[PDB]
Amino acid sequence: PGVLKIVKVYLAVKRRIQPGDKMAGRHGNKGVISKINPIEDMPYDENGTP
Amino acid sequence: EFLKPRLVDIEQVSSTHAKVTLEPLERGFGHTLGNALRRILLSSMPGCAVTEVEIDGVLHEYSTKEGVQEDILEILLNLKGLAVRVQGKDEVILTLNKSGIGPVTAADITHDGDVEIVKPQHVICHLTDENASISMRIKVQRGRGYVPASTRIHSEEDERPIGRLLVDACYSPVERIAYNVEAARVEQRTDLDKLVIEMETNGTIDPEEAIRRAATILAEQLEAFVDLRDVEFDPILLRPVDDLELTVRSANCLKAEAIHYIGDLVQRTEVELLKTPNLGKKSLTEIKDVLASRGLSLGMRLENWPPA
Amino acid sequence: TAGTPSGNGVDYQDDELPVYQGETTQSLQDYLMWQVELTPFTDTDRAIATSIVDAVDDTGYLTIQIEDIVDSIGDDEIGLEEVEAVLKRIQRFDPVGVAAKDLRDCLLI
């Protein structure tokens, strides 16, 4: 009875992955990110794939 | 007293795979030139990437287009993988219109003056009914590294209309680099090394040109070590004091007390400014009345007072 | 009901013996007295500032007269000459034009 009009608004955002974020495998191995490393610093094999 | 590597035997396996050989090398230099080259080539190579898109009906990314099989987000992710090679420009616009059935690819992008599509079979969209059309404008820019769309704000200096479809830009044409050091076939010398570099790219940058660019970057960076050597602001202040329109008696009093700027005055407390000769209780409130209209109460504290 | 509005945000004090307790709020005079505390004023100047801030309406206008402000102080050397100076200093606060005598004063300030 009081209500005269209702307007609903929906917002959408994208969450960029960041170190303070928490990650896990499905064996009970959880952890948070400590650093996002440039591609030339990661270990790589003989074919050059890091 | 050191041999200098030469660019010989550059062979190209595929449109993206290639091999580069540096035949003469000393004992340890193989890796010093190699690892340095791999780091430079993986980190800082120029390229061209799609920066923003403008589809007709779509105004954002979380919508759908009737007759198109994929969402706008999937179309943008497809466009992120489009590889182009522009010449003489940094802001080409790639108009694309296609109505009918079947996957839409870069091939049917309108033939620009100097723009090369390295692979024209790269699909970006699908059409599902005869009476459907897709029309879009794609902006391509030249850059060096990974520039996220969210991290850039100078593009918002001018307001962008509702309907933009910006995509993260990578700008890096190199995907994988491996190097390996072998023994040179030169038998007259006791033992020499040969460096072989395999680079896998998107077809946009030439292998020899990439090696030249990396070597030039390294030389410019080394130029610094070749000869290391080496061994009271706010505009209301700092204003002429004859801008407060004070009474006559204040003019001589301020001159007598060496008050010539606005900032120095506001640093004077009531009890110590009253000690000045013939200041006047009512005249003091006149000084405060004028400085209050400016918002400047007496008793402020500045740190450094310049002569200007 | 064809459509129902979402429930309005509500709260209640949990893990506290005097349940629901309360919450402080900021008003116009509370925000003006905060600025008075952080500006260089003397004791008498602070007293005058509190006196004229208490008289500010919700609109932020000065409901009481300046002469009535001088009367309220009832202190020597607190004539309207310095009450006016403190009044202008207060008028030049964050809601510019607040504590103004009338409509002309708001626009002039």
- What is the Cα–Cα distance from B192 to C30, expressed in whole angstroms? 83
C-alpha count within 13 angstroms, C-beta hemisphere, residue B67: 16
The first and second tokens of residue B223, run together, are 């130029």
- Judged by CB atoms closer than 8 Å, whether chains meet at A48 and B179 is answered as yes
The first and second tokens of residue C72, run together, are 């309220």
Helix or strand (DSSP H, E) at B195: strand B193-201
Of B84, B148, B146, residue with least CA distance to B118: B84
- Judged by CB atoms closer than 8 Å, whether chains meet at A12 and B62 is answered as yes
Residue B52's DSSP bridge partners are: B139, B166
Mutate to test the interface with C, among A6, A7, A10 (most CBs of C within 10 A): A6
Contact criterion met (CB below 8 Å) for B258 and B225: no
Nearest chain A residue to B40, by CA: A40
- All residues at 6 or more sequence positions from B151 whose CB lies less than 8 Å from its CB, including other chains: none
- DSSP-assigned letters across all residues of A3-49: ----------------TTSEEE-TTS-EEE------TTTS---TTS-
Q: Is A4 an 8 Å CB contact of chain C?
A: no
- Judged by CB atoms closer than 8 Å, whether chains meet at B285 and C81 is answered as yes
Contact criterion met (CB below 8 Å) for B165 and B61: yes
Mutate to test the interface with A, among B61, B76, B77, B176 (most CBs of A within 10 A): B176
Contact criterion met (CB below 8 Å) for B140 and B52: no
At position B168, the amino acid (one-letter code) is D
What separation in angstroms does the CA of C71 have from each of A34, B124, B181, B281, C84? 67, 81, 97, 20, 13
Helices (H), C1-109: 28-37, 43-54, 66-73, 80-91, 103-108
- All residues at 6 or more sequence positions from C90 whose CB lies less than 8 Å from its CB, including other chains: C32, C36, C49, C52, C53, C98, C99
- Judged by CB atoms closer than 8 Å, whether chains meet at B288 and C82 is answered as yes
CB-nearest to B295 from C77, C86, C92 is C92
At position B50, the amino acid (one-letter code) is V
Which residues from chain A sit within 8 angstroms of residue B177, using beta carbons? 48
Helix or strand (DSSP H, E) at B165: strand B165-166
The first and second tokens of residue C27, run together, are 């008003």
Which residues from chain A sit within 8 angstroms of residue C5, using beta carbons? 3, 6
* Distance, CA of B272 to chain centre: 55
Of C46, C39, C34, residue with least CA distance to C78: C46
- What is the Cα–Cα distance from A41 to B90, expressed in whole angstroms? 30
| Resolution of the coordinates, Å | 2.8
Which residues from chain C sit within 8 angstroms of residue B294, using beta carbons? 92
Nearest chain A residue to C1, by CA: A1
State the nearest Cα–Cα gap between C13 and chain B, in angstroms: 39
Number of neighbouring beta carbons within 10 Å of residue B3: 15
Number of neighbouring beta carbons within 10 Å of residue C15: 5
- All residues at 6 or more sequence positions from C66 whose CB lies less than 8 Å from its CB, including other chains: C80, C83, C84, C87, C101
